[PDB]
Design a protein around this nucleic acid. Structure first.
Length: 203
RNA sequence: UUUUCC
């Protein structure tokens, strides 16, 4: 396709964090192009993603899309698992739009957002073995019920899990079922702490 | 063991 209109560029790019180690710009493009078409979120011929720039330190990427609306749609993939990792999809910090009718137009089945706001039933899960990737922890929690939001905390320099995560169930009543099923679980030198995150949050 | 450029 043609080059993108320059005055919509800020509205045609997204930050993508927590990318897989060793990923190429081509592999990232192919993943997003395929997911958008498989989800019915692109119907026009041709690829919705024009380019991917992976930062020199290889921890995040910026994606550029051919249209403003497809960029907004791609926000709905926040949290999608790619090679075991929860992709963190966000607006560029210098994107300042737009009040009226910037949020994804349609939801993507099975994708769980990484944005976990503090709230009544937000859970903290601590003591997790650090060999478990984002996918496996998400699966541990999804056993109890579908998730609305989830993030596993990792070291920003090594990519290794720090052994704790946060989540929110779709059904608020699943919260207590997950606590009963996981809190106090013993794993060698570690014991899971599973409780509403408000109970132990720093002040 | 309270989410990371141009």
């Amino acid at each position: 396709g043609p080059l993108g209109s320059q005055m919509t560029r800020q509205a045609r790019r997204l930050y993508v964090g927590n990318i897989p180690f060793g990923i190429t710009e081509e592999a990232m493009m192919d993943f997003f192009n395929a997911q958008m078409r498989l989800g019915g979120l692109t119907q026009a011929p041709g690829n919705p993603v024009l380019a991917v720039q992976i930062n020199q330190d290889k921890k995040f990427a910026f994606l550029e899309f051919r249209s403003v609306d497809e960029t907004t749609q791609a926000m709905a993939f926040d949290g999608i698992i790619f090679q075991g990792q929860s992709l963190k999809i966000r607006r560029p910090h210098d994107y300042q739009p737009l009040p009226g009718m910037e949020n994804p137009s349609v939801y993507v089945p099975g994708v769980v957002s990484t944005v976990v706001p503090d709230s009544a039933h937000k859970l903290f899960i601590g003591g997790l073995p650090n060999y478990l990737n984002d996918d496996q922890v998400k699966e541990l929690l999804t056993s109890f019920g579908p998730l609305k939001a989830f993030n596993l905390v990792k070291d920003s320099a090594t990519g290794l899990s720090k052994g704790y995560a946060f989540c929110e169930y779709v059904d608020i009543n699943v919260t207590d079922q997950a606590i009963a099923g996981l809190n106090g679980m013993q794993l060698g030198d570690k014991k899971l702490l599973v409780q509403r995150a408000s109970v132990g949050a720093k002040n």
